[PDB]
Structure 1
Amino acid sequence: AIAQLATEYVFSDFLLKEPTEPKFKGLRLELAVDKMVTCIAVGLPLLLISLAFAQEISIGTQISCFSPSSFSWRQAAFVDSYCWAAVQQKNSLQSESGNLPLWLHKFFPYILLLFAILLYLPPLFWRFAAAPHICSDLKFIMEELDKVYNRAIKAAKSARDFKYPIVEQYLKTKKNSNNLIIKYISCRLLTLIIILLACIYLGYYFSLSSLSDEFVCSIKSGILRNDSTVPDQFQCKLIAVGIFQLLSVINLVVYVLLAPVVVYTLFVPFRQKTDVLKVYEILPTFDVLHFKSEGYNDLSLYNLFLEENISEVKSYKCLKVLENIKSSGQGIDPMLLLTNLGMI
């Protein structure tokens, strides 16, 4: 039913499932905006496919040819099925709009499924190629941040009663390499191109005259070519073509609204803001150097992933509340850190 389809595709965790494995425990591995874009671009065409053939919206068979009254039920069924299979056969049918509109009307669900698959492909390539590496690197970075926070609080407590910036060096090295950012931009660009092509196709499909679904059909090949009792042609109409056009314009609207989001996603350096690591600069055990901005490198992408999935880090949360309290400046950062006692 329509409501069942809605529950499956919008109100359920459709493509929102976290990786089912212990390797990525709590790691999104995909930005929220990218996940939203993929979920829409994939589950919208599927939802429209399901809707267009819902038991309520669908009168019945997808084509009716209006055989003569003399024709029996199965003769008329032969006519309808023959014309359905003959939309491909150009000789059999003669339609003013041509044969491409008939092909599109017959295979619209296939085309929507193709677009959905093509849009799901780049996210899958990301999750299967560049996701494990960033997952491992980000897990190491979070562990290093937790360890340095613990060491700093232990030092503060000892004072009240190595020291090498490994994480900073690793981030600096990431500043050079750009394979991950190149893959990310390539997959986003392919998604954008697929969306644009889908918009072109949907606009063309919705621009039809709405009468191209009606085509003339001739069961006059073979032994029936010179038969007399059979009329030379029939009036066939492809039902649900109006529904297809409505859903196609809906998908076109959604995709044109979505494309600016993908374009904004492509410009990762601009998105790289609100320095996540700036909060850690007040730790004595952490060097006061952010050095993450203004670069078409994997460093900006790692900064984005950190700003996305750093809320799970207790040390980061503690430092963030310390920073927020520092806005008033009533107290002192080391005193607040010592009082917090948030090692684990």
Structure 2
Amino acid sequence: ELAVDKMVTCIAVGLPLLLISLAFAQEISIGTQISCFSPSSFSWRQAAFVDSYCWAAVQQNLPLWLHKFFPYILLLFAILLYLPALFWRFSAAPHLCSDLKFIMEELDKVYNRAIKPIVEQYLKTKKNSSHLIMKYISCRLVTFVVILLACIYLSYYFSLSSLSDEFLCSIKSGVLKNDSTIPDRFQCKLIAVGIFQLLSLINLIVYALLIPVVVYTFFIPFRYNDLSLYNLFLEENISELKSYKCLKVLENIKMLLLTNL
């Protein structure tokens, strides 16, 4: 598993969940996302009914609608970022685990036979496939696209969120539209939206790292073949290879040394 992309993924997941959990902790801290005026004649309950009404009224200036739903959309993005990892955890990971374990021992046998090519034949045959490299391309890029719409959404959010912290709510509705004690609209403040707009900029800012970093992961001709992706697995899993390290030190140095190694 490619660590940076994995770490980027792990971090990309941590941020919103943190933000969401804190928003929840803040929603737990605030208790409501909105409030409105009332007449002072509105009882302690009557005003509570207004607040809850307008909090419900949101689904009927369009961002004012979205402003309520904003946090859960974030959660949607978080889930949408996570699942490609579980998907990728099966698109390719079951293949490579077998691949590496084979690759290791045959190169160790190349190493061992040198001390005293089936993986190369296999690997330069994996060269033939475009399937698993395109598996990587699609799985990563799709995940990347999740970030794009979030950032665009957060941008389209933030840009207009800056001007739409408040609205006037009517609860003069139905039969109790006829109650004149209800002002035709209450003015209402979308309490969390400033936090969210801040949170939005925060997440957006950090996500503006993750996007081109994953883009950087595709410049493999400068980092076209599964081999080139195996070369990533090489650049990756050299991590696993004692004999490579030994032979790389040998290569660094260059049967006595092999006898000493």
TM-score when scaled to structure 2? 0.92
From the superposition, tell whether residues 133 and 152 of structure 1 become closer, same or farther in structure 2 (CA, over 3 Å).
same
1:54, distance to aligned residue in structure 2 (A): 3.0
Contact 1:64 1:80 in 2 (8 A): yes
1:232, distance to aligned residue in structure 2 (A): 1.9
SS, match of residue 224 in structure 1: coil
Q: How many residues are matched?
A: 260
TM-score when scaled to structure 1? 0.71
Greater CA deviation, 142-151 or 61-70?
142-151
CA deviations over 1:305-325 (Å, ceiling 9, x no partner): 122122222211211111222
Contact 2:15 2:203 in 1 (8 A): yes
Q: Which residue of 2 aligns with 1:339?
A: 259
1:193, 1:55 → 2: CA distance?
Answer: 29
1:109, 1:336 → 2: CA distance?
Answer: 65
Structure showing greater radius of gyration is 1
From the superposition, tell whether residues 337 and 244 of structure 1 become closer, same or farther in structure 2 (CA, over 3 Å).
same
From the superposition, tell whether residues 336 and 80 of structure 1 become closer, same or farther in structure 2 (CA, over 3 Å).
farther
CA deviations over 1:26-70 (Å, ceiling 9, x no partner): xxxx10121022123222121111223435994442111122211
Contact 2:161 2:197 in 1 (8 A): no
1:270, distance to aligned residue in structure 2 (A): 2.4
Contact 2:50 2:171 in 1 (8 A): yes
From the superposition, tell whether residues 78 and 116 of structure 1 become closer, same or farther in structure 2 (CA, over 3 Å).
same
Contact 1:189 1:266 in 2 (8 A): no
Contact 2:63 2:161 in 1 (8 A): no
CA deviations over 1:108-148 (Å, ceiling 9, x no partner): 11111111122223222111222101111111001212233
2:245, 2:31 → 1: CA distance?
Answer: 58
In structure 1, the gaps of 5 or more residues are 1-29, 90-98, 154-164, 272-295, 327-334
1:261, distance to aligned residue in structure 2 (A): 1.0
Greater CA deviation, 51-60 or 217-226?
51-60
CA deviations over 1:67-123 (Å, ceiling 9, x no partner): 22111122111111111111102xxxxxxxxx4222222111111111112222322
Higher relative contact order (CA 8 A, sep 6+): 2
Contact 1:46 1:113 in 2 (8 A): yes
Contact 1:62 1:238 in 2 (8 A): yes
1:314, 1:177 → 2: CA distance?
Answer: 28
Q: Percent identity of the aligned residues? A: 91
In structure 2, the gaps of 5 or more residues are none
SS, match of residue 141 in structure 2: helix
1:34, 1:264 → 2: CA distance?
Answer: 10
From the superposition, tell whether residues 149 and 217 of structure 1 become closer, same or farther in structure 2 (CA, over 3 Å).
same
1:214, distance to aligned residue in structure 2 (A): 1.1
